[PDB]
Every structure is written in structure tokens, then in C-alpha cells.
């Protein structure tokens, strides 16, 4: 079962340096674990702005998670998560950049709490969205609302904690889930 998966990862300064390193390590671990041909990966850093660090076609040409993320420059600015999700939905899931028409679209949004910006993510509604939290401010009442909004429904199945989520033996079968 094919899956095109985008890591949308938070490069803003609210994260502690070690927390951002854990995000990098998490993405690389998942790509290393879920390495079979059915999976393709892209990664987009967001802060004030959004940068595709690598697309699906880069992933296929290299398939070396360490080399693909080698040159990521830490943005360390604000947290425009809404604009970021919209960016992925419209600018990353493209046949142009190596997306597969038959593949299930999955987004792993890795972040530490609420966004600087607001709006809607209607354009991403056909995408299966997981929210992977890190940090001491990730689940408060300040952010509860935003995280529910970003996650696929039921949110209780899609809002995760990086620390516990990364240990799942059946992680690759979990991200392939399509009935929910």
C-alpha cells in the first residue's frame, strides 16, 4: 500500500535546541524504519516562511535520510503553521515533484503548540493529518483548539506525542492506516 508522506516540521525559535534536534532525528528514524518502496517522503521546514528541504523525487534519487536533511538551515523565527499546511496541500503533493497519484497522502505536522497565524486548512482536508507534539507547552488550553483543528478526525487518534509515538513497534503499519 503506497503512501506519500510529508514531514512538516517546526523551525521556529519557541522550540528548545534539543527539541528541534529530536524532530530531525525523528524524521530520519521514521524514513529509516519505513524504508520499503511503498513509502515516499518529502520534508518542509516552516517558521515565518516555508521551505521544501527535499521533495519526493529527491527522496527517490538519494534515499539517504542523513544526506537529505544534511543542509537544513534552522529558521528560528515565528510559527505560521496555517500557511504552512496550506503550502504543503497546494505546493508539495504534486506529480511535478514526484507525488504518486495512487498513493495515500499523509502529513506529519511536528510542532510545539499553537500558531502565530490563523485561517483555514480546507485545502488539506483530503490529506490524513497527524500532529506530533514536543515541548512543555504543546498541550495547554492555549493550543488544544489549534491542534484539534490541524488533526484528522477523530483528533484523539491523530494527535500524538513524539516521545511515545516514536517507540511504536508497528509505526509503519500505523502511518498506512486508512480506515479511521
Amino acid at each position, epitope marked *: 500500500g503506497n503512501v506519500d508522506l510529508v514531514f512538516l516540521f517546526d523551525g521556529s525559535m519557541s522550540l528548545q535546541p534539543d527539541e528541534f534536534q529530536k524532530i530531525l532525528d525523528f524524521m530520519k528514524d521514521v524514513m529509516k524504519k519505513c524504508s520499503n518502496t511503498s513509502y515516499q517522503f518529502a520534508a518542509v521546514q516552516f517558521s515565518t516562511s516555508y521551505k521544501t528541504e527535499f521533495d519526493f523525487s529527491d527522496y527517490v534519487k538519494w534515499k539517504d535520510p542523513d544526506a537529505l536533511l544534511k543542509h537544513v538551515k534552522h529558521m*528560528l523565527l515565528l510559527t505560521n503553521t496555517f500557511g504552512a499546511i496550506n503550502y504543503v496541500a497546494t505546493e508539495v503533493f504534486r506529480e511535478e515533484l514526484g507525488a504518486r497519484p495512487d498513493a495515500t497522502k499523509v502529513l506529519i505536522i511536528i510542532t510545539d503548540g499553537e500558531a502565530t497565524d490563523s485561517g483555514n486548512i480546507d485545502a488539506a482536508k483530503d490529506i490524513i493529518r497527524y500532529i506530533i507534539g514536543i515541548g512543555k*507547552h504543546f498541550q*495547554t488550553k492555549e493550543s488544544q483548539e489549534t491542534l484539534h483543528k490541524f488533526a484528522s478526525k477523530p483528533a484523539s487518534e491523530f494527535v500524538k506525542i513524539l516521545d511515545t509515538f516514536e517507540k511504536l513497534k508497528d509505526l509503519c503499519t500505523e502511518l498506512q492506516k486508512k480506515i479511521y
Partner: antibody
Amino acid sequence: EVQLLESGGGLVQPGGSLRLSCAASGFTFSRYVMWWVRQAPGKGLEWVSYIWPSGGNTYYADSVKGRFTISRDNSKNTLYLQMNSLRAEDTAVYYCASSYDFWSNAFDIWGQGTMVTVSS
Amino acid sequence: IQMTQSPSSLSASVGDRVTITCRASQSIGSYLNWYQQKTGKAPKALIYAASSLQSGVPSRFSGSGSGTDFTLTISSLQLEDFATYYCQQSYSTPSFGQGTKVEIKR
């Protein structure tokens, strides 16, 4: 525009107490870690305290621990500093400031400052 | 984390290019910020994240560096730029460099 306005500064005898206030306007105060940062005359900037958005968790520089208390009223968008047992070394300009990106360790907005003088 | 700023003070003519350095006691990646403080005024952010100029700040200001060594540049010093400049690491809880006092040479 966004601003922070301090008030409450003045002359206090050593051992006395004083309360500073900082009114926020133009931004969503309740989302931000808030700080007090002070500057003694002709010296550098020293953070003395900060408080999480909800106002539960509080933190203090060792120079002020046990003597100062930070608090906030998100309903009035106001930040407070209760200074007790004041020493000569606490004489400084006191600024409030917000965390850049809600809770980074960079400073976003600064108040105008309020002078505190501790002298008998 | 100790931030060593350099020099402590400098004198330069209007239109001159000005360079201020800041060294950290450990690698702090890009968690390095610059503030300007004029007399009897609060600090004001010029640069976040080593190189990111903040809106409103004149484009003559620029920041560079990562790891341990950082630089604030004023491409053409103006009368307005008379002030004290501080670097500030945001890697852990804030610490500041000692400051650099810029005077106008005439």
C-alpha cells in the same frame, strides 16, 4: 501598535517592598511568556524573572529568588512584580518584556522602563 | 553561556562601514540576537536568528554567523545609529554580551 507600559517605580528604603505593574496592549498577552529584566546604571541587562502564559510556572534569577514574586492577570492583560526585602543592589531600571514566538528565550516587545532606587 | 562582545566601543564617521563581533563560549547554532539601545530608552530588536532583520529596521543593518562567532554590520553608519548594541543568546535562558558603544566620528 503593540506596547508595554511599566509603572510603580520609586525610592524605597532597604528592607522595604515595592510593586511594579506592566500593562500590555495591541497583542494577545495571554499567549506569551512575560519577563522582568533590569539594568543597573551603566551596566548590562539582567533578567530577574519570568512567567508562563497561564501564570502557573514562575522562574527567578538567583539574585532575586525568595524576595521577588512575579504574577499576571490575563483578564486585564497586566504583569506584576512584588519586590520584598529590597537591597541597594536592586537599584536599576526595570523593564517588562515578552517572549519572541510566545516562549522563546529571545525578547520581542519591551516596556519603556521604570526606575527603582533602594537607599536609606 | 558567556557571550564575549567586541569591541567595547568604537568611533566611526557617517557613511563608514561598521563591524561588531560576538563570541559564545559554546556552539549556540543560530540562537543569536542583536538589540540596539539608545540613552534613556528600552532595547529594540534589530536581528533575530543570527541573520534575520526585523521589519521596520533599516536595511543597512545585517547579521551573520553560526556556532560560536557572530557579526553585526552597519553598511553605512548614520547619525541615528549612535547607541549601544548588544548580542543576546537565546539558546538557553537569556545571556547578553557586554555591549558595544558606537560614537560618531566627526
